[PDB]
Each structure stands twice: as structure tokens, then as C-alpha cells.
Amino acid sequence: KQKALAAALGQIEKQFGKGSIMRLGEDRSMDVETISTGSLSLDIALGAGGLPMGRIVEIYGPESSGKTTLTLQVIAAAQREGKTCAFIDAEHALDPIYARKLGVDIDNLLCSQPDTGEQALEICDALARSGAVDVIVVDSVAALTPKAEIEGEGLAARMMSQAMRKLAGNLKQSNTLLIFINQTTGGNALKFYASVRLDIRRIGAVKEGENVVGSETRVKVVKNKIAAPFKQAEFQILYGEGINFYGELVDLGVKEKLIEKAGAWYSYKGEKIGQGKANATAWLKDNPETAKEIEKKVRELLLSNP
Amino acid sequence: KQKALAAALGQIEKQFGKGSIMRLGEDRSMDVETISTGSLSLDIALGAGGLPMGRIVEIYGPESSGKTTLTLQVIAAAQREGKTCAFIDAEHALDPIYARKLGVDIDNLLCSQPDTGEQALEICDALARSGAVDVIVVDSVAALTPKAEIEGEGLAARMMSQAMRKLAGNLKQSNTLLIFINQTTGGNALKFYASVRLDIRRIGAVKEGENVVGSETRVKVVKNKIAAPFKQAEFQILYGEGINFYGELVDLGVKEKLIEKAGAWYSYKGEKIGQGKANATAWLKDNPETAKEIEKKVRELLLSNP
Amino acid sequence: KQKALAAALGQIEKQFGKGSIMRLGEDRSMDVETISTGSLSLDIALGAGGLPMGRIVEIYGPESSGKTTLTLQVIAAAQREGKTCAFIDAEHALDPIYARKLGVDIDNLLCSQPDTGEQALEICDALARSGAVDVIVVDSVAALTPKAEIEGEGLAARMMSQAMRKLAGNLKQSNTLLIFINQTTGGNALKFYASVRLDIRRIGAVKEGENVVGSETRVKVVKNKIAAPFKQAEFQILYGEGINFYGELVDLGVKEKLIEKAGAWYSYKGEKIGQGKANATAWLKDNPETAKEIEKKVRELLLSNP
Amino acid sequence: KQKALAAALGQIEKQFGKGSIMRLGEDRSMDVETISTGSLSLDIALGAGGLPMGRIVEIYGPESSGKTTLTLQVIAAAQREGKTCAFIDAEHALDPIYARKLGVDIDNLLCSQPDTGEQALEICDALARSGAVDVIVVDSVAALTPKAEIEGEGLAARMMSQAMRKLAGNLKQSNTLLIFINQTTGGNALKFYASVRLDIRRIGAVKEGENVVGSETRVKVVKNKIAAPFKQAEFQILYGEGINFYGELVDLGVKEKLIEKAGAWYSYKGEKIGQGKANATAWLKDNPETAKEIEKKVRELLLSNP
Amino acid sequence: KQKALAAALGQIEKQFGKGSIMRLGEDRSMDVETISTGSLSLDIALGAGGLPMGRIVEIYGPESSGKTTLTLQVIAAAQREGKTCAFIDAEHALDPIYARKLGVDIDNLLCSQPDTGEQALEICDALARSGAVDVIVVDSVAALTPKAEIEGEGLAARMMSQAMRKLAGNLKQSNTLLIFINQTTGGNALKFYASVRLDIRRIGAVKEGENVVGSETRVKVVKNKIAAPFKQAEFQILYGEGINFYGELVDLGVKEKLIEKAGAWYSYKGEKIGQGKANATAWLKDNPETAKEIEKKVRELLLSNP
Amino acid sequence: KQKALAAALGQIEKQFGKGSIMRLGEDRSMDVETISTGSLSLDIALGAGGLPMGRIVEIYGPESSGKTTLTLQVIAAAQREGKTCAFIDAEHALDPIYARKLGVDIDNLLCSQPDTGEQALEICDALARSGAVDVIVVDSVAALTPKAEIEGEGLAARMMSQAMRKLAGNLKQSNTLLIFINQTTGGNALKFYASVRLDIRRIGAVKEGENVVGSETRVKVVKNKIAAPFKQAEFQILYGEGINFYGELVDLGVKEKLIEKAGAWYSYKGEKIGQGKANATAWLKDNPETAKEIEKKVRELLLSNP
Ligand SMILES: [Ca+2]
Ligand SMILES: [Ca+2]
Ligand SMILES: [Ca+2]
Ligand SMILES: [Ca+2]
Ligand SMILES: [Ca+2]
Ligand SMILES: [Ca+2]
Ligand SMILES: [Ca+2]
Ligand SMILES: [Ca+2]
Ligand SMILES: [Ca+2]
Ligand SMILES: [Ca+2]
Ligand SMILES: [Ca+2]
Ligand SMILES: [Ca+2]
Ligand SMILES: [Ca+2]
Ligand SMILES: [Ca+2]
Ligand SMILES: [Ca+2]
Ligand SMILES: [Ca+2]
Ligand SMILES: [Ca+2]
Ligand SMILES: [Ca+2]
């Protein structure tokens, strides 16, 4: 019965490798170093608690979907840990003012604005082989124009395929995380080589009465080779501020029974934290020590770990 | 006369096997274990009352045709019986929220997101040989990219042909049902190895006045080796709910004279069930015991059995 | 002069057989049992008044050319006479709803959906040898995939050639008519073994103002061994109805001076039948006895008989 | 000098036969009965004024090159003289509607659609021996499939070689002209046994502003044993009409100074015939007596006769 | 650590060239001759202190964004240095009155109003090859209509791509600066060949109470291959006057602690310059020697130089 | 030393005949009458200045290699001298229009289109014995089908061997030149009996910008018994014009220092002839007297004569 199945799946993983197959509800994950996305719900949706070092990740969605914010939050989180980041740009749209607001150390951010799509990929491969960079962000796949097209002479897909295998191997060896931002364009190479694929969309507005101050966002983990796929995350992205992390903390804290909200006050460990979600959120922001403890517990309860 | 024909067809079946030839109107079917599709009219169209264990089935149609819903309903029906299901995914589009609404036990659903089209087929074959899985769903044939294509080096058809014979044999031996979702692409291997091929399409909208709440669906059984082919099924797929099974039950109940609808009330066995099809449908939903009896009778009258 | 030629041709037929040579304008035909095509003009184009029992016939044309309709009309006409029909299918596209509208007795139609192109031909041969089937329809030559191709291992032509001689002999002996639907593919075997080859095409639309309700069709008898070849037929195929037989009857009736149309009314034997071709057509439909007599006369005047 | 050469060539012809050698510019031709090709320029290119009775002729070219039209015009010209024609068909593509437009008496045209390439040749030989047919047209060499090939068991070349010698001898004895249409395929037998070989091609379009109504055609007499070889002919083939004979008459009439075109009018024998080539052409068409006289003179001036 | 990174980046630059990658905060720049934009903040944003000779620059933005003013200020600055400028016009909108107010020497400005988009590019290439012109301004990309479009027969993108490579090479060789004004249209050729791309927009109005006398402008350096990209510049464009350079000088002087403004007076090197920013601005305008010294210091402190 | 060798070689020639052995660089040649090939460089490569009367020559190469042009130029050159030419054709591909453009007098060209390969050779032998023909061209060896093959009953080689000895003897006696065009096929008879064998190939295209107007040709004298073998010739064959003789004259004139080209003008004997090779070529074409003198000198300097 159970043994027969467990033994069968074992054979599958033995022949095809770890992560080749799993029950969507299992609390299993690869032992990979991760970098936070800046979103607690997304970190949980990823199972491993963040994006995996040494792998290829694809983040796609419509313009203004939030992929820009997400990408910058990842860079900021990485730099926070002392990790070196490189931005390979073919979009020419980085906003350093917004980036700094999200905590990005722009002064120390490495940047290249390649002459062709092929050159952009070659630079990524060189950086991957160097083992001197921790995170590489490519903005974006759709903008990586093949040299032949630029000169006005399927091509994009061919360009991606010819570089992906070597890139993936070099990234794994140096434990470098590479994120491809997309809108997906580029062919099947990225789709199959990616260890994680994120579908991000704006599903509504955040208002302060009549004034729109943010966006309701939803990210679906459509592909995940480090933990079970298909979980999703919903959170708010506030203009000029980024992901409303504390709002997520309150919601998850309440859902997991860590934060109580019956009666006139929300409370944690029996202590008052605020009247209403807003005040409770602001309180956690003003009390990092407690916020940190709640986050730790939420991760312990919801991450896909043994 | 009649004897001469019966004797001739017998020779055909003796030489070519059972199901090699039959009159489209005969009440004959193979003695195979089946899994419901979630649609009463389709189960009837299949003759045997559901999809056949141990065989290969192809379900194809345009995007949003309803093949997704149909596939999930099959998984849910199978799990309902305690059967183990595996989802081999190359589309990266499963929606667990909608799946749970259809009754799918996502937590216990096995899932693989293969690195190549060839790997996906090898995993299917391994699972088939293990005899530890009851239902395998492959989404989708069009997405099974050959390794050579992924690397940017007829190929898809060759990939399918090289695996089909062995896969079919292994599935039959372990009595594992495998469903290939398609849009058909892949060549002739699947077309000829499949025991059942379903053509599903959206033929209209279901409205509640001005608001669209569902789709009118039609499924044609274009190939059927377990019972007579070419029957069709029409039913509604309601957004967020799935196949309107009870609506089918009312329609078939009325057509088969089991449900009376003259006068002010619809009735069964002389008892009032509702005024109007809608109320009658809701009533059957609220009275499973009666609904179950009506379904049993409908199957007794319309399934292709001795 | 005339005698010298008649004597010469006689020698040709004596050495090579009846139908080996003839003047295209001669009123000669083989004494074969025939089945109507559902089209009066085509039955006339065939010279013998229909398709020949015991022979091989090829009907080819583009998709939506009308070959499907034509094939179903033949089956319906045959069943009308109490003849047994078998449908050997490798296309998986039969539409029983449309078939019933054309008069096909689907319930009594025998059907096989072979596993390979070779198996399909072997089943045809077995049925031919049994002498228990009157008409066999194969849909289609292009879809009869050789086993080697299905397994992904000139082949199609070889497959057809290896079976044709034996099939033709068995069909002749049991007086079974076999129709191969094609698009021609398959090699030269069918081309030379066929007693009749029909080229069917859609040459325009039939409209009711701005709405298209049918197709103008043209069938050319490119090969005919039962009567003189190369005659053609033009008729309409109306959606959901089939061949507009009565429209043909009116046209041929008028051309042969059987139906008068001068003045305000069309007439037959001096009796009013309608004002305008449309009304005259509807009238014949409402008066089968008169329609039957007109058809009989048209055949007497236009069929290639002594 | 001159005598030495004339005496030498005489010896060649004495040893090898008449037509074994000649100066390409000599006005010499065999005294053979001929049939017009329907083209004045081609009749002239042939030297003898038409195709030779009792000999084998090959007409080859791409599909739509005009060989079909040319072949039908020959049949029509022959029938015009009361000659009996036979069409041996393995292509199954004769269009009687177009044929009648070209003047072909379809009703009196003999036709055979042989079962094999060998049978087709045997029928040609039988007809040749009968002496009851004047013209035989074989469509086409490429379509004459050897029996062994049809049954799926160099062969075509062998088939042609085994029949050519006897066929040529029988045709000569009965003074029967045989034309092989080709695309050349079949080996060397036809190439060497043919008394005339024609290479026909479409070299452009004939337009009426923006609408294409015909084709500019060119025929090269690549082999000619009845008169000097290598002359060519250019003429137009108008859709639904055939060879623009009168257009050729005007061109040749003008080139030979028979038709004057200086000033405002074209003229013949001093009489106005039209303003512009088009009107002049139409005029000749409306005045057969004058057209006939001009053609007679053109032939007197350009045919290769003593 | 640091060495490992420095060595890695060195390899990148060695393989891909100088400027292929850099930290956004580094004080590095290419040793290129530059021309001032007329804006101190923009000159600083450019890192090198102005636009680069021998390269292609793109300046884009909405109508009335200020790109016109910026372009004219560049020409005026260039002419001030004795450099020869050419204006390639397809917009037909130059205002010489406003141009002269900005310091442009219209009388000596070369001008072409090309007949087609292709001709405009060919003239640019010819001028680039001549080495007789220092600055070329093209107004504008959107207005360069391909000849085929003009004649009413992707095309624009193809036109740009076919000329860009050769143009870039010729410009570099003669050290000619070329500026393409755009709104971006034209395809990817310009985007990748440009060494600098400027995004300019009007972000507000400048008022003198109730009267609007200018525009608040913002320029973002979205692409920069001569120094680190993404810096921005904000300044005012006053109607009939151009860029408020002295206003920028005061702001930057104050920000860099060069200009003191505590108490009742603004001061430099301890000397009073004015009460209020306006008076301080006017003072610098009236005292070029001091203004020049302050600008020199600001550049020393803010330009990206070793 | 030198004497010992000269005496030894003398013995060789005495025993085996003149031309049995020679130093490849010697200026020696047989005193045979020659006919120009139409190519100055080839005439020089032949050593004797043209093809030898009374001998057998083989010219072989791929289709479109230029052998056709070369062969026609030889005929034209011969006829120019009042010599009688005969064309023995088994290819049926002569183009009189192109031939006339090359200067061939088609009207006076003798032509035979033999019934078999054996007959073709017998006719060549008869013409050779007659002593009434100066040049015989056989097109081609590959097309000379043995009678046994034509009838479908090593053979070709045997056919050639049985005729070669007698043919060679008869040709020598009447001083008739015979050229066999080939593709080599036919066996060893021709290879050893030929006094000259030419290998001709197309080695590139001649363009007028983007339009191809000719072919770069190379002819290698692989066998030469009238002068030293192995020299080669390169020249252009222009479509519709033939060998670019004047282009060769300019090249050889320049190489031999006869034509000067330093400075702004090419010159001969100090007189300007043109600016650039093209104009210089056209000039020589317009000034035959000077061209003739230059050719005479080139031959005096480069032909292999005492
Ligand atoms: Ca590292
Ligand atoms: Ca919320
Ligand atoms: Ca509380
Ligand atoms: Ca099992
Ligand atoms: Ca309904
Ligand atoms: Ca009731
Ligand atoms: Ca029977
Ligand atoms: Ca009609
Ligand atoms: Ca009437
Ligand atoms: Ca006769
Ligand atoms: Ca013309
Ligand atoms: Ca005149
Ligand atoms: Ca210069
Ligand atoms: Ca300001
Ligand atoms: Ca102060
Ligand atoms: Ca002589
Ligand atoms: Ca050259
Ligand atoms: Ca000179």
C-alpha cells in the first residue's frame, strides 16, 4: 500500500533525480541557500523560504504587475546579506530613486547595458563562471534583441537555447542566482531550465478612501523544483514604499492563530498591539523584536521543511 | 442472412480482436474498470460509463474549451474512490484553487514538472511499470518539447512514437489509466494507440440575464475502442463550480420519462420536486438519495451494456 | 470504313477485355448492379446510373469539397435498399447527426477504427471475402498510417500495393463495393485498380441573399471503366440537408424539355407545378409520384444504356 | 569543292538513309502526310508543315506548359480532316469542356484507360497494327506505371524499350501517327525512335491590363527527322480559347512583308484591314478567305520544301 | 574578496570592452571630448560633463517636453567652441527666433530638409564620413518617413537598422556627435547603437504668481556608455530664455556647501551675494567670474572622474 | 651532362615518336594546322595556338561548365576560315539563337541526329573518310546509347573501343578535327586516342553589382600531344555573348608588359586607350587594328614555338 508507493517514487527520484516528483502537500524542500523576495507570503509559497542560489528563475507578468518591485526587493534583500548583485539591462528603465526607497544599495550595484541580446547572455555566463557575483538580474527577456534583428537581417528562441545549458551549468557551479524578468517570450529553453517560474499580476487597487496608494498583487509559483509548485501569494505593493511586509505578517499571524483579534484589541502572547489591523501593522513596524519572533514562528509553521 | 453476418463479424473479431468492429447501435462494451468524467452525458457517450483503466486516452480542444475542467473532474472522481493520481506537467498552469472547488485532493496529488518531453514520457512509463499509480494526466502533448528543440539543435512525432508502444503495454499490465491533454500535435502514435479520443469545445455561453456565468460545452467521442464510437455529450461548465451534473440529470431524467414535467410541477415517482428546471435541479442537489436513484436508472437505460 | 474500325476495336476488347476502349460518346455500359450517389447529375455522369457493386472506387478532393456528404449519401442509398454497409475509419471524424439528416441508419452501420493502415486493409479484405457486406467505405487513404511510421521506424504506397490485388479480387467475387476516400496519396495501386475515380470540388457558395446556406459542387468522373469517362456533374450541397436532388431534377427536366417554363408557370405534362425554379423544386418535393416519373424519364434519356 | 561535299553527303544518305544528315538551312523535307499542330509558327518550325503520319512524336514540358493544349489542337485538326483519333490515358485528366472549345469532337474520340503501363503500350501496338486509327495520343509517359511497380514488387525504361521497336514498325506500316506526352522519363528508347521531339514551355503571361488571360509559349523542335531540326515557335495560348493562330498570322504576315503596317492602317494587297495589331487580327478572323490566302503564302515562303 | 571581484570585472571588460560593466556609484568615465547640454545638472548626470563626440545620442520625450530647447542649447554650446553643426530636418519646425535667444548662430547653421527618411540617413552618413562637421542633429526619428511609405506602397525599423552600423562607424572615425530627437519609434537599432539615451519630460510649471513663465523639467539618463547610467537632472526652462543655468548653479552650490545661505544673506567665500535664491541667482549672472569658479568646483566635486 | 640527356630523349622520340616525351617548359610544338577556341588564354594553354586538325579532342565538364560555349566558338572560328563543320547530335539541345550570337553560321552547319550510338560513330567515320568535312563535333559521349541498350537487351566502352582506332586513322588522313563533348564516360579508348583533353569548369560568377551576367571559367589542358600539357586558362563567359576575348587580351597584354596601366590611363605604344580595365577593354573592341597587333605579339611571346 503506502510502502509500495513510497518505494516506487523512490525509484523515480533515483532515476530522474530529487524533485522529479512529489505530492503537492508534502513538507519537503531542497537544502539550497535562499534570498528573500521581500514578501513573506511569497517566501512561504516558494516552500524553501526564498529564491534559490545557483539556479535560474523566471519572473513574468504585464507591465506594472509588480515584477519590477519584486526584482528590486530581491536585490535589496541580497545586498542586506552582503551579497554582490549585477543588473544586466536591455530595458533602460531602472529607477534608482524608487530602488533606494526599497533598500537597494545603488552605488554598489553592478550594471551592464549590453549591445546585443547575445552579448547580454555572454556577460551573464562570464559573471556566472567568475564566481564573484551572487545575484544576476536580467531585464528583460523580451528586450534581448538578437544581433541579426538589430542589424535588420525563432531567432530569439534560438539565441536563448544556445546559451541556456552552459549558463545553467556555470550558475550552479558558482552558486549564483540568476533572475530573468519576462513578459512568455524567448522559447522553451528558459521554461525548462528554470528552477522557479513566477507569474505576477496586479489584481486590484489599494485605496485610502478615494486616493489610490497601492496595488493588490498576486504571485503564482507556476513552476518549482526546490519545493512543491503551485502555491500562491497575495500582498500589497504601496507606491513609493514597496511590498507591505507587515500587512502580510499581520494576516498570516492572525490566520495561524499567533495573533489574536477578538474583542477591542489585537494581541500577541497576551499583550495589546493595536485596535484594528492598521494600528496592529504599525505596531509591529515599531516593534521589530516582536515582529521578528512572529515571522520566525510563521515560517516554522508554513515553510515546506522536514 | 443474420447468421451469415454474425458469423462473419465473429471471424473479424477472432482475427483482429474484440472491438475491431461493431454496429454503432449495439449495446456492447468491454468489461473494463472505469472512472467517471464528472459528466453524466459523457459517461453515457463513452458507453462503458466512464474512462477505461489501463488504457491511453486523448482529450483535445481549444484553450478554454473545458478540457482543463474535464481533466480535473476525472482526477477528483478517481481520488474519491481512493485511487492514486499523478499529474505530469509541462504547461505550468494548474490552478489548485479551482481544482479544490472541483473536489480535487491537491495535497495528495503527485506532480512532476519534467525537464524535457522525453523525460516526461520516461516518467510516465516508470510510473506505469510501478503499478503504484491509478491515473496519470499529462498536460500537455503540445508542451512536451523534445530535448533537441530545447537546446535549439517531425521531432515531436518521433519522440511520441518511440515511447507509445512501451507505454501502452506497461499501462495495460498495471491497469493504469493515462490521459494526454492536447490541442492534434504529436503525430499518429497517440491517435492509433489511444482507446478513447475526446473532442471538446465551448459552443456557447450560460447567462443569468446579462451576466455570463458559464459555458455550454460539447464533447464528441471521436474514437472509442471500449464501446461504440461517435456519441456526443452536451453539458454546462459553470465558472468556479465545474460541470453542472444535476442539470444533466434533470435533462436525461426528463428525456427518459423518469422525471415528469407536465402541469405546474416536475415530479419523480409521483412526488413534487420543483417548479421549473432550475428548482428541480436544486432539489436533486438537496436530495442525493433520489438523485442517486435517478442516475442509476438513467445509466441502466442508456449505458451500452448487455 | 466503319466495319474496319468496329472489327479492330472488337479485337482490342477481345484481347484486353470489355471496357478496354470505347468512343466517349457511345451509349454503352457494363451490366453491373449500382448504388445511387444521391445526385442525379452524378448518377448520369457515371453512365451506369450509380456506383458499381464489386468494384473499387476512389473519391478525392479538398477538405469541405463535399466528399463526406457524397460518401454518406451513398451509404444512405445503399441502406435504403437493405444493403449492409461498413465504415472503416482512420480519420475519427464521422458526424452521426449530419449522417442521420442525410438518411443514414447509423444504428445499423458497421464500424471499425483500425490500429494501423495495414490492419485497416486486412479488415477490408476479410469483409470482402466474407460476402456478408455490400458496401465498404474507407476514410481515408491519407490517414492509413503504416505500422512502421506509427512506431517511428514510399511506405504508404508499398502498403497499398501489397493489398490492392487481393482486395480487388475478393471484392469482385463477393460483389462488394468499396470506396476509398482520398485527398492522390497512396501511390499508383489504387489509381489503376479503381473502376471509377471521382474528383469533387466546391466551386462556389449558395446564398439566400447575404446568408450562405450551401455550396456549389462539381464532380468530374476522371476514370470510368463501367461506362465512358470524363463526364461531370454540378449540383448544390445544402448545409444540414445534403445534395439538392430536386434542384437537379428541375434543371435536367428543363434541359431535356420534360419540364416547360415559358410564360408565368413551369409545367409538366401540361400541369402547373410552380412559378419560378424554387417553387417548382418544392412542388416536386411535395409530389414524389410526379418527381419519380420525371427522374425515370431523365435516366432513360441520359444514361449510357443500349 | 561543292561537288565533293554533295557527293560525300550523298554517300552518307545512301548508307544511313534519307534524313541521316543535312545542312540546317536547307529547304528539304520528307514527303510525309502531316497534321497541323494548330500553330502556324510551329507548323513552319517543323519544316514539313505539321506532325508526320506514321511516325512517333514526343512532346514534353512542365505542367501548364501548353502541351495539353497543343495535343488537343492536333486531335482537333486531325478530326477536321475526317481522321480517327484514339486517346490512351494514364493521367485521368482530360477536360472535355476545354477540348470542345478547341474544336475536338469528344463524342467520336476513342479512349482507353489501361490497367498498367505495359497494357497501355500493347493497346497502342494493337491499334497501330489494325490500320484503323490515324492518330494515337498517349498521356503520358511518366504515368505509364510498370505492372511490377503497381504491385509494389530502370523498370520503366525497360518497359519502353521492349515495346518501341515493334510499335514504331507497326505505326509506319499503317501510317499511324503516335504522340507521347512527357515531362525526359522513360529512358532512351523514345528519344531515339521519335521522328520529332518538341520542347514546350510557358515563357510569360498575356495580359489585358491587369488581368491575365493567356500565356506566352515557346516550342523548340529539338529533334526532327522529317526536316531540319532546331527551329522554334512562339505564340500565345489564351485561356478557354487555345492557340492564338490569327495573332501568329499577323506577325508572320508582317515579317514576310505580306501585311503592311506603316501609317494609320495595316493592309493586305492594298486594302485596309485594321488600325493596330489587335484590330488587324480580329479582321483576319472575320475574313477567312483573305486569312487563308495569307497563310498559304506564308507557308509557301517559310516551309522547308523544294 | 575585493580582489576576486576586481579581477573578474577586468576579465569582463577585457572580453567585452570598456564600459561593458561598472558599479553605478564609481567615479569612472571615458576620456571623450564633450559638448555641454546647457544644463549643469544634466552635464553632471552624464558623468563625463556633457554629450560625447563621435557617438550617437538619442533624446526623446513628449512634445513640449523640452527636447527642442535641449537640442538647441547643445548646438549653441558647440558653436561657442567654434564647432560646425548641421541640422537634418524632417519636422519643418525650427524656430530661429527662439534659437537665437538661446545663443544659436543660425546664419552659420548647416541645414538639410531631405526628401525621404533614407535620404536623411544617407546625408548623415556622408557628413559623418567627411569629417568636416562636429555635431549633427536629426529632427526627428518619427518624421523620417521611408520612401515606400511616402509613395503609399516594420519599414521604419528596417530603414534605421540598415543604416545604423555604418553611420556609427563613420561618426566614431571622424569624432562627429550625432543626436537623434525622438518621441521610442524606429526599432532597436538606435536603442543599442546609442552611447547615451535621454528621457526628458515636463514635470510642472514655473510661475511668477499667477503667470506661467516656464516649465519644471526632468531628464533621466536611461542609457550611458561613457559613464554610469541612471542619474537624473531637474532644472527649469524659461519661455524665451532657455535653461535656467544660474538657478541650477545656486541649487548645486548650496547642496555642495559651496554657497552658504544661513541668516539674512547667501554668501560665497564669505562675501554677500544676495538675499533669497532669486537675488543670489541674479548676482551670479552679474558676476561671471565668481559663477565660473563655483561651476568649476561643482564639476570637480560631482563629475564622474578619477 | 646536357648532351647525354638530349641524346637519350632523342632515342625515346625515335622509338616512340615525336611528342612521346618533353620537358613541360620547352617551347616546342607540332606543325599542325589549328583552329582557335575563341579564347586567347586557352589558345596559349594549348601551346600550338588552337585545336589540331586531323586529331581527336575531348572536352569534358559539368553541365553549364562552358563546354557548350567553347564548342560553338570553335565551330564559329572554323567557319570564319571557310571550313566545313558537322554536328553529330545525340543530346538534342543545340540553341541556334545563342549559336548565331557566337558567330556560328547555322544555315551552313551540317547536322545528324543518329538513331544509335553505333550509327553516330559510323557517320563520323564516313565523314572522316570523305575528306569533305573539316570539323566534326559530337554531342555527346554520354548520350551515345548503344543499340543493345536502346532495345533494352561495359557496352558503351566496347562501342567506343571498336570504332576509335579506325576513326582516328581516317581523321588523320583527311586532316579532319573531331571533338567529343563529354561529362569521363565511354571507357579508355577516347582517353588514349585523344591528342588533346580539356577539363572545363565554372569557378565563379561575373556580376554587374548584384546582377549575375556571366561565369568565371577555367580550362585545364590535362592531355596534350601537340605541345606540353597541363597549362590552364581562365576567362569569362558572358551570357548571350560568349567568351570575353578582349578581357583576356587586356589581362595578357598587361601581364606581358605590352599594355601599361600606371597613372590615370592604360596605354599601348604610349597612346591612351582607357581609364580602368573596362574602358580599356571596350577601346580594344572599338579598335580592331590595335587589338590585332597586341594579340599577335602576345602569341609571339607565349605560344610554344621555336
Ligand atoms: Ca562566489
Ligand atoms: Ca487583504
Ligand atoms: Ca483581544
Ligand atoms: Ca496497482
Ligand atoms: Ca440546455
Ligand atoms: Ca407534474
Ligand atoms: Ca453477399
Ligand atoms: Ca445552378
Ligand atoms: Ca408555362
Ligand atoms: Ca488506315
Ligand atoms: Ca508577341
Ligand atoms: Ca498602311
Ligand atoms: Ca573633423
Ligand atoms: Ca526647484
Ligand atoms: Ca549668510
Ligand atoms: Ca578535305
Ligand atoms: Ca579576372
Ligand atoms: Ca599610364
UniProtKB/Swiss-Prot annotation, chains A, B, C, D, E, F:
Induction: Induced by DNA damage, repressed by LexA. Induced in response to low temperature. Sensitive to temperature through changes in the linking number of the DNA. Induced by cold shock (42 to 15 degrees Celsius) (at protein level). 5.1-fold induced by hydroxyurea treatment (at protein level). mRNA levels are repressed in a mazE-mazF-mediated manner. It is found in: Cytoplasm. ATP binds at residues 61-68. GO terms for molecular function: ATP binding; ATP hydrolysis activity; ATP-dependent activity, acting on DNA; ATP-dependent DNA damage sensor activity; damaged DNA binding; DNA-binding transcription factor binding; single-stranded DNA binding. It comes from the Bacteria. Keywords: ATP-binding, Cytoplasm, DNA damage, DNA recombination, DNA repair, DNA-binding, Nucleotide-binding, SOS response, Stress response. Its main location: cytoplasm. Disruption phenotype: Triple mazE-mazF-recA mutant cells no longer undergo an apoptotic-like death upon DNA damage characterized by membrane depolarization. The rate of DNA-strand exchange is stimulated by RadA. Pfam families: RecA, RecA_C. GO terms for biological process: cell motility; DNA damage response; DNA recombination; homologous recombination; recombinational repair; response to ionizing radiation; SOS response; translesion synthesis. InterPro entries: AAA+_ATPase, DNA_recomb/repair_RecA, DNA_recomb/repair_RecA_CS, P-loop_NTPase, RecA-like_C, RecA-like_N, RecA_ATP-bd, RecA_C_sf. One of its GO terms (cellular component) is cytoplasm. Polymerizes non-specifically on ssDNA to form filaments; filament formation requires ATP or ATP-gamma-S. Interacts with and activates LexA leading to autocatalytic cleavage of LexA, which derepresses the SOS regulon and activates DNA repair. Interacts with the C-terminus of RecB, facilitating loading of RecA onto ssDNA at chi sites. Interaction is decreased by ATP. Required for homologous recombination and the bypass of mutagenic DNA lesions by the SOS response. Catalyzes ATP-driven homologous pairing and strand exchange of DNA molecules necessary for DNA recombinational repair. Catalyzes the hydrolysis of ATP in the presence of single-stranded DNA, the ATP-dependent uptake of single-stranded DNA by duplex DNA, and the ATP-dependent hybridization of homologous single-stranded DNAs. Mutations in this gene were selected in directed evolution experiments for resistance to intense ionizing radiation (3000 Gy). HAMAP family: RecA (MF_00268). Belongs to the RecA family. This is Protein RecA. It comes from Escherichia coli (strain K12). The lineage of its organism: Bacteria, Pseudomonadati, Pseudomonadota, Gammaproteobacteria, Enterobacterales.
